[PDB]
């Protein structure tokens with residue numbers, strides 16, 4: 001049962017992940033794995049207990065569209081080990097290497113992400129940071145959402161979140177908004193507000209609902225039913241946003257209505 005990986009079994013290697021909440025290495029433990037080391041310079045119980053409580057959340061997930069949790073380490077450092085996704089993150093495809101997907105593919109990526117999110121929500125889990133960098137595209141066909149719950153993602157924040165108004169702005173619908181931005185990513189191929197170069201103004205405007213994604217860049221072959229759904233997920237008033245079962249429904253419908 002329990003998923004604690006004993007010292008020295010894992011083998012950390014080439015480095016990739018930077019930043020806070022930890023560093024990510026490609027490693028080996030029963031095959032290629034990813035290892036994220038929280039690098040919190042040795043807790044500090046019960047931080048050691050706050051960590052275990054997050055691993056409790058991960059282990060509630062078992063779905064092809066949710067990144068596979070394989071286990072966690074406490075021995076050398078605190079660390080979380082997942083399947084190693086072969087391929088690139090969605091952010092990398094769209095914005096770094098400018099991969100051009102068939103609209104059919106684009107809808108399917110959208111469908112899958114919605115699928116995995118519906119699931120996370122079904123199991124009462126709020127991502128709190130959906131965005132293309134966290135949607136890994138494995139063997140270049142399957143979606144793997146990872147990376148759970150304030151600078152690298154203001155583009156995906158719903159207004160209620162941006163204008164840090166109360167304790168918990170985070171909600172299924174705050175996710176649905178982030179979903180709505182990655183929909184804009186898929187369909188426009190761009191990031192939102194590319195023409196405003198001052199990040200503070202963005203934060204200010206988006207929070208007051210003066211600013212919002214210019215939906216008139218959805219590339220021509222974007223189904224109107226998609227463009228409409230995109231706009232529905234982006235509603236400035238969070239209560240007007242669909243939840244994922246319905247989002248999924250609309251995507252599945254406009255999907256089967258397409259190839260002919």
Ligand SMILES: COC1=NN=C2N=CC(NC(=O)c3c(F)ccc(NS(=O)(=O)c4ccccc4)c3F)C=C21
Pocket residue numbers: 016017024034035036058061066067068069080081082083084085086087136145146147148149
């Ligand atoms: C270039 O970077 C990469 N190329 N291939 C990769 N394959 C896996 C990668 N894993 C990760 O980035 C990674 C991790 F190592 C531990 C935890 C979480 N998320 S978490 O802790 O939020 C979590 C979410 C869902 C299920 C379990 C844990 C991660 F997202 C990174 C890759």
